[PDB]
Amino acid sequence: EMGQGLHTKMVQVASRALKIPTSKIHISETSTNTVPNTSPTAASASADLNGQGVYEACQTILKRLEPFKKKKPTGPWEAWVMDAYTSAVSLSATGFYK
Amino acid sequence: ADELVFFVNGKKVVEKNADPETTLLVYLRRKLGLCGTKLGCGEGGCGACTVMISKYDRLQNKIVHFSVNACLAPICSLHHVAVTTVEGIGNTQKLHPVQERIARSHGSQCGFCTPGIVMSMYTLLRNQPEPTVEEIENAFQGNLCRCTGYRPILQGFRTFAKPSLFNPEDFKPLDPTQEPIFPPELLRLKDTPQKKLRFEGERVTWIQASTMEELLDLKAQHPDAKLVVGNTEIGIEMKFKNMLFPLIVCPAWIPELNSVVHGPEGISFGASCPLSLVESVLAEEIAKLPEQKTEVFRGVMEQLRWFAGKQVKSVASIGGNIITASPISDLNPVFMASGAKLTLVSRGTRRTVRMDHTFFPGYRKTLLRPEEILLSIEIPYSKEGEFFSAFKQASRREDDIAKVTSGMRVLFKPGTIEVQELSLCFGGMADRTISALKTTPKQLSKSWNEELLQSVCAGLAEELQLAPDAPGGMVEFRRTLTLSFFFKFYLTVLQKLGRADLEDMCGKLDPTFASATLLFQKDPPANVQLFQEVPKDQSEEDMVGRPLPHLAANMQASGEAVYCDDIPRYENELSLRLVTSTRAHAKITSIDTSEAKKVPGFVCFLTAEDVPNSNATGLFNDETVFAKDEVTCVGHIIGAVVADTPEHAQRAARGVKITYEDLPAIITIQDAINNNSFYGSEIKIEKGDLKKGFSEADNVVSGELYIGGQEHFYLETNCTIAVPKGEAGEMELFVSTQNTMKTQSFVAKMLGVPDNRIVVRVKRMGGGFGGKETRSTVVSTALALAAHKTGRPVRCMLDRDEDMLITGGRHPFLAKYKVGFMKTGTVVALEVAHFSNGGNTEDLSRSIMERALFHMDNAYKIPNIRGTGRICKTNLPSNTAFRGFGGPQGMLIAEYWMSEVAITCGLPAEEVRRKNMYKEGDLTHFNQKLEGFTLPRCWDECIASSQYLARKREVEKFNRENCWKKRGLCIIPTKFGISFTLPFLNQGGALVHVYTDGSVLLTHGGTEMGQGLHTKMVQVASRALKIPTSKIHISETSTNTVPNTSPTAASASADLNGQGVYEACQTILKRLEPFKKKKPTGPWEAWVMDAYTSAVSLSATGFYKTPNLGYSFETNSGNPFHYFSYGVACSEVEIDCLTGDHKNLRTDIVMDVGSSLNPAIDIGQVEGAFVQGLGLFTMEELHYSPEGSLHTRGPSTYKIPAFGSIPIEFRVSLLRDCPNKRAIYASKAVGEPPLFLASSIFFAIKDAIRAARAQHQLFQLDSPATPEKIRNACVDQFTTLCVTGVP
Amino acid sequence: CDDIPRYENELSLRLVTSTRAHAKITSIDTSEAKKVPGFVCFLTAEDVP
Ligand SMILES: Cc1cc2nc3c(=O)[nH]c(=O)nc-3n(C[C@H](O)[C@H](O)[C@H](O)COP(=O)(O)OP(=O)(O)OC[C@H]3O[C@@H](n4cnc5c(N)ncnc54)[C@H](O)[C@@H]3O)c2cc1C
Ligand SMILES: O=c1[nH]c(=O)c2[nH]c(=O)[nH]c2[nH]1
Ligand code: FES
Ligand code: FES
Incomplete structure (x- = not known):
């Protein structure tokens, strides 16, 4: 983030991809020890590239929550998450785009 | 003058405003930033703060070197000396031989004790470059280690005296000429005479007196002036008894108080002579004089053997011991019995008294007048x-x-x-x-x-x-x-x-009485470690199953490894101190902070009112962050003072005055039973037909057993730094915790922010052992609130006394059993009711009771069986996880009634145990099938390598030959179920990155607490990836790299995280496969760079869950455990029937760790676990007042195993050829299962006590089997006379 | 970045730059630098590990 509103956009993207309010999603910083081998934030391309990355990471989480969604189609997001956790389903994912 | 000048690691320090209250430890750490030297207790009993002092001794015209506890040394005492810390002797770029040897020999696990032990060994070698084995052991009488079980330290160091886990031939040789020079300034400075110094602090003035005239003038004008010499009593009075002496005079420099003069009647020591000088002088006299003259000298030396350790005796003065006048002085009874002559002086008076009953007229008083000082003591020739x-x-x-x-x-x-x-x-x-x-x-x-x-x-x-x-x-x-x-x-x-050769015959001892008179001595150690070589075909780069030293061992030996409080403070960082309840159960009627507000640097007192969101915390939500309206144990946290410094926080906490109105308290297990005060309902496992089993038995035996609790005594106490980021509620916490997830949860809930704002980071802990699985959070949440409130970073490290009080321990258990058995020793019926003392929150207490019930069988098939458990809710600090987690309690009870089965049947115990033991394919009482049942092999190998039957004969013979010493021998098996009792906790995660230089950064959910988990995960990653371990690094554990992690507990962490790590590595390999095929030899670096320039992701998560777990108490079906750990220990002891002391002569362990991931680390876990169990069953005891106040709050009163505690011959074998396919690379978990095997010492003691009692039947032996319990059970003419008044 | 609180032991760095477009460095004299209170060291190519 250098003032171009990149984190804002990525939150907007993640919120649509996950179908949850932006209020439940947070970006705190950028670090080499969370995402490695990153291109510079340059070439006006960073929302294009990171948007896709975020979208894919979100799609992986959604795929893992699907069976919990199917069993509790209305019961809130928080109930699917706690159900996945107590079923020992991973709630962490990487995402990538080229 | 008024400048304080000394040297640290060869560099001159000039301190223009020395405060008399500043210790060397604080000065080193906070003023010079040298954090190698640690705080472990602050009371001189642990040695973690050990440093070396060098000075020019004017009285001998030589340079001297000695060790001291930095935690008790006033900097104002150190003018014109030279300090050496761990940083001063070497570093990872060039390790001192002492550093290299402790690290390479697997003598460092958590590493927190390592600098202190290094400095004790180093100090020994500066005084004696070729010490004996005995001198090496003696160097560490003042150093505690909680992790290693001491064996590897002594074994690696034995190399300095006079397949393999390490290779001593690769150790670099010691050249004593290459040690740091004595600072030439201090030799010059010794030509100029000493003048009086005065230092003025915030509260205390210190006068360093140069002459007798200065001292006696000061005491005449100000009799109040408090003498300080070694500070080993006054330091304790100031730090722990809140005593404040506003004027101190240190007379240590005065020649007349340091002289040693021979006289016709004996040897006079100046009252400021350190006990180490008394020892060295008396040792020379004893060696050169006829025995007939040195009877009193040898009495003093015998007491000094057992007086503290080298660090305290280097500074503790003979006069200080006398004038302290403690009821439990070890020297005053010897001076009194020998009528030692004391010289007392004042300005213008001088008198002499022979010490007698009169010298001590009441509690800590002597007959010195306020203006007198003790000049000298004359220890007589006999x-x-x-x-x-x-x-x-x-x-x-x-x-x-x-x-x-x-x-x-x-x-x-x-x-x-x-x-x-x-x-x-x-x-x-x-x-x-x-x-x-x-x-x-x-x-x-x-x-x-x-x-x-x-x-x-x-x-x-x-x-x-x-x-x-x-x-x-x-x-x-x-x-x-x-x-x-x-x-x-x-x-x-x-x-x-x-x-x-008298003219008139005295009584002669029968040879059976001879051993009663022997002075304690132990033979030198003889240790054997056996493990399995990896396949001959295994690559040299594949380190799985090789004895790779702990990855941080060199840094731990060098004091470069960073623990929480070693992290530098921010310029704006504040200090927090908890304020706790002094009542078991009371209403808080008022809180007055008026005195706290006057302490300089005071910021605020936090209470329940300050909590932003929820005051409800703890695993089951039944705990307060801060007490509201009422307190429910002594140690219940009421609030937290925030100030600039720890010292100011401590002074301000004393100014928080609470008024209480007592409420009925429930303290003991029996109080809770009487008041129906429990956590939830009875837990029960039952199988078969009890009434039938009891009515078919030949014999029925009933009894009760009490098992005391245990303090973890991690050498690093609980510690949190919370750093507020000032944005969106964001906060980062550096914590000594096994449980990042619950730390994060509990902080977020208290503040009312989402988990996503809160990051918890753990680099390493100086020990955990279960005591930081949950109870760390009571600190974390308090510092987090302070950081939020102030918007400044805040830190808190608990003092040992605070930690032992607040954070609880192992659950004491009370059990009632009835066992029915045949004349053959076959058990046919068993019923056990268990009660645990849970304290004042639920925490892990119910799960612990579950695990006890799951292990009430130990190794034994019992067809008709019933166990119940109830957890008592009491007004004590909440008890928690401790390595074994209910297992050891449940299994001691089993072994206790099993011992009584064997005695009742009159059959050998080993045979009775063996014929009751499960076999392969048997179901447990909880209906889990035992597959890959290696226990019989552990048993047979242990019987053979221990030479059990032969040694049984040797014990029998010793016992016929000795009336007042007896030996005992016992062999104990164990079965220990691996997996969290709560199934969903059996999961773990990893995150791996490969950078474009080919180096790999790995992280997983597991935390390092000395168990070598990161070392094991790097070994696993290196095999999985087929690259050298050197290319993989783990830096820390953090909630923002791997979320929703289980605590590092239940011995399961390498199993869970190793799978996680393995899967993440498989993902990376799959992605590199096309690059490997196109260049099948090209190095790893080319594959990686080709992947990167092809825009292929080089980051992956991994995850694992243990499958097919889930026990139901309702139906007694479902597997709680993934597999079982198995092992056997044979121990032999020798008890002193007249004192209750004993020696641990020999222990042989055979442990199944599957195909060990790392046999060095796994042998270290066996020995470490075993020695904590030795503590639990024979040494460690906590004592509480009737009103529920813990009295045992430091190493002075809580005695964990010391270097001299361990079995003299200590033999550990890892079972060969036993792959466990259902854990990572066929390994097994190792952390907790060996602990219970120290029960072999308990039952060996019981067997020796039986032999003592026969010399003069199912007698009682509760745990721990302390000297008190052993001596009292050796009933004789002395016990009879003392109790009944009948000879 | 610079709003982050300083550690108690944190030091400050100042870069020293060329006042010539193209030149040989014939010598460096740090004698005056060393007399400034709080000076720690002057790093050059020689110090690069
Ligand atoms: C870890 C540890 C283990 C210990 N183990 C033992 C043990 O096993 N047995 C045992 O008996 N003790 C033990 N002690 C107690 C303590 O070490 C001794 O009592 C010690 O000898 C005190 O001497 P000091 O020079 O440190 O006294 P300081 O603490 O400096 O002073 C002690 C008292 O003596 C006074 N004093 C000192 N010199 C004079 C003098 N010349 N004239 C008049 N007053 C004087 C001081 O005013 C003060 O009241 C232990 C202490 C520690 C910290
Ligand atoms: O089944 C267990 N659960 C735990 O939470 C725990 N903690 C620990 O030290 N050992 C165990 N065992
Ligand atoms: S910290 Fe000094 S002896 Fe324990
Ligand atoms: S390695 Fe010694 S206390 Fe941990």
Whole structure:
């Protein structure tokens, strides 16, 4: 983030991809020890590239929550998450785009 | 003057405004930033703060070197000395031999004790470059280690004296000329004479007196001036008893207080002479003088063997011991018994007194006038026909407080066995050192024979009375000790008379009595570690199953490894101190902070009112962050002071005055039973038909067993730094915790922000052992609130006394059993009711009771069985996880009634155990099938390598030959279920990155607490990826790299995280496969760079869950465990039937760790776990007042195993050829299962006690089997006389 | 970045730059630098590990 509103956009993207309010999603910083081998934030391309990355990471989480969604189609997001956790389903994912 | 000048690691320090209250430890860490030297206790009993001092000794014209506890050394005492810390002797770029050897020998696990032990060993080598094995052991009487079980430290260091886990031939040789120069400034400076110095702090003025005239003038004008020499008593008074001496005078420099003068009657020591000087002087005299002259000298030396350790004796003064006048002084009874002559001086007065009952007129008083000082003490030569003994019995031999301590002297009419003088003096039997003055006069002129023995014993039993409520308890044992000591003296005198060739025959000892008179000595160690070589075909780069040292061992030895409080403070960082309840159960009626607000640097007092969101916390939400309206234990956190410094926070916390209104308290297990005060309902497992089983039995045995709790004593206490980021509620916490997830949850809930704002990071812990699985959060949440409120970083590291009080421990258990068995020893029916003391929140207490019930079988098939468990809810600090987690309690109970089955049937215990043992394919009482059941092989190998049957014969023979010492021998098996009792906790995660240089950064959910988990994960990653371990690094554990992690607990962390790590590595490999095919030899670096320039992701998560777990208590079906750990230990002991002391002669362990991931680390876990279990079952005892206040709050009173505690011959084998396919690379978990095997020492002790009792039936032995319980169970003429009043 | 609180032991760095477009460095004299209170060291190519 250098003032171009990149984190804002990525939150907007993640919120649509996950179908949850932006209020439940947070970006705190950028670090080499969370995402490695990153291109510079340059070439006006960073929302294009990171948007896709975020979208894919979100799609992986959604795929893992699907069976919990199917069993509790209305019961809130928080109930699917706690159900996945107590079923020992991973709630962490990487995402990538080229 | 007023500048303080000393040297640190060869660099000059000039401190222009020295505060007398500043310790060296604080100065090093906070002022110079040298954080190698650690805080472990602040009370001189742990050695974690050990450093070396060098100075020019003017009185000997030589350079001297000695070790000190930095936690007790006032910087104002150190003018013109040179300090050496761990950083001063080497670093990872060039390790000192001492550093290299402790690291390479697997002598460092958590690493927190390592600098202190390095400095003790280093100091020894500066004084003696070729020490004996005995001198090496003795170097560490003041150093504790909780992790290693001490064996590897001594074994690696043995190399300095006079397949393999390490190779001593690769150690770099020691060149003593390459040590740091004595600073030439201090040699120049020693030419100029000493002048008086004055230092002025915030509260205290210190005068360093240069001459006797200065000292005595000061004491004449200001009698209030407090003398400080070694500070080993005053430091404790100031830090722990909140005593404040606004004017201190240190006379250590004055020549007359440091002189040693020979006289016709004995040797005079200046009162400021350190005990180490007394020892060295008396040792030379003892070696050169005739035995007949050195009886008192040897008494003093015998007490000094067991007096603290090297660090305290280097600074502790002989005069300081005398004037402290502690009831439990080990020297005052010896000076009193020998009538040592004391010289007292004031300005213009000088008098002499021979020490006697009169010298100590009341509690911590002497007959010194306020303006007098003790100048000297003359320790007498013994005369012809004058004999002396000294005794001490404590909880532990080394660095303990005496329970009873004594000096005894007899003088015979020349040529005769007729008494001219007799002096029997005792510490620990009153509020001062006393003489048995009613008993001794009655013996004058009597001959030294059986009537005198009997007369003295009756005299002592009547004269040394203790009320049943006497301060300190243990009244039977203490009284028994006074007679037992006198008996040993009686016999020793007979032996000495026998050597004299008198004209008139004294009694001769029967050879069965001889061993009663022996001074304690232990043979040198003989250790064997056996493990399995990896396949010959295994690549040299594949380190799985190889003994790779702990990855941080070199840095731990160098003091470069960073623990939480070693992190530098921010310029704006604040300090927090918890304020706790001094009542078990009360309403808080008011809180007054008026005095706290006056302390300089005071910021705020936080209470329940300050919590932004929720005051409800803890695993089951039944705990307060801060007490509201009422307190429910002594130690319940009421609030937290925030100030600039720890010292200011501590002073301000003292100014928080709470008023209470008491409420009915429930303290003990029996109180809870009577009040129906439990956590939830009865837990029960039952199988078969009890009524049928009992009615078919040949024999039925009933009984009860009490098992005391346990303090973890991680050498690093609980510690949190919370760093507020000032944005969106964001906060980062650096924590010594096993549980990042719950730390994050609990902080987020308290503040009312989402988990996504809160990051918890753990680099390493200086030990955890379960005590940081949950109870760390009571600190974390408080510092987090302070950081939020102030918007500044805040830090809190608990003092040992705070930590031991607040954070709880292992659950004490009470059990009632009834066992039905056949004449053959076959058990057919068992019913056990268990009760645990949970304290004042639920925490893990129910799960612990579950695990006890799951292990109530230990290794034994019992067809008709019922166990119940109830968890008592009490007004005590909440008890929690401790390595074993209910397992050891459940299994001791099993082994206890099993021991009584064997005795009742009159059959050998090993046979009774073996015929009741499960076999392969059997179901447990909870219906889990035992597959890959290796226990029989562990048992057979252990029986064979221990030479059990042969040694049983040798024990029998020793016992026929010895009346007052007895040996015991026992072999114990164990089965331990692996997996969290709560199934969903059996999961773990990893995150791996490969950077474009080919290096790999790995992280997983597991935390490092000395168990070598990161080392194991790097070994696993390196095999999985097929690259060297050197290319993989793990830096830390953090909630923002791997979320929703289970605690590092249940011995499961390598199993869970190793799978996680493996899967993440498989993902990376799959992605590199196309690059590997296109260049099948090109190095790893080319594949990686080709992947990167092809825009292929080089980051992956991994995850694992243990499959097919889930037990139901309702249907008694479902597998709680993934697999079982198995092992066997054979232990032999020798007890002193007259004192309750014992030696651990030999222990042999055979453990199944599957195909070990790392046999060095796994052998270290076996030894470490075993030695904590040795503590639990024989040494460690917590004591509470009737009103529920923990009294045992430091190493002075809580005695964990010391270097000298461990089995003399200590043999560990890892079982060969036993792959466990259902954990990572066929390994098994190792952390907790070995602990229970120390019960072999408990039952060996029980067997020795039985032999003692036969010398004079199902007698009681509760746990821990302390000297008190052992001695009291060795019923004899002495115990009988003391209890019943009948000889 | 610079709003982050300083550690108690944190030091400050100042770069020293060329006042010539193209030149040989014939010598460097740090004698005056060393007399400034709080000076720690002057790093150059030689110090690069
Ligand atoms: C870890 C540890 C283990 C210990 N183990 C033992 C043990 O096993 N047995 C045992 O008996 N003790 C033990 N002690 C107690 C303590 O070490 C001794 O009592 C020690 O000898 C005190 O000497 P010091 O020079 O440190 O005294 P300081 O603490 O400096 O002073 C002690 C008292 O003596 C006074 N004083 C000192 N010199 C003079 C003088 N010349 N004239 C008049 N007053 C004087 C001081 O004013 C003060 O009241 C232990 C202490 C520690 C910290
Ligand atoms: O089944 C267990 N659960 C735990 O939470 C725990 N903690 C621990 O130290 N050992 C165990 N065992
Ligand atoms: S911290 Fe000094 S002896 Fe424990
Ligand atoms: S390695 Fe010694 S206390 Fe941990």
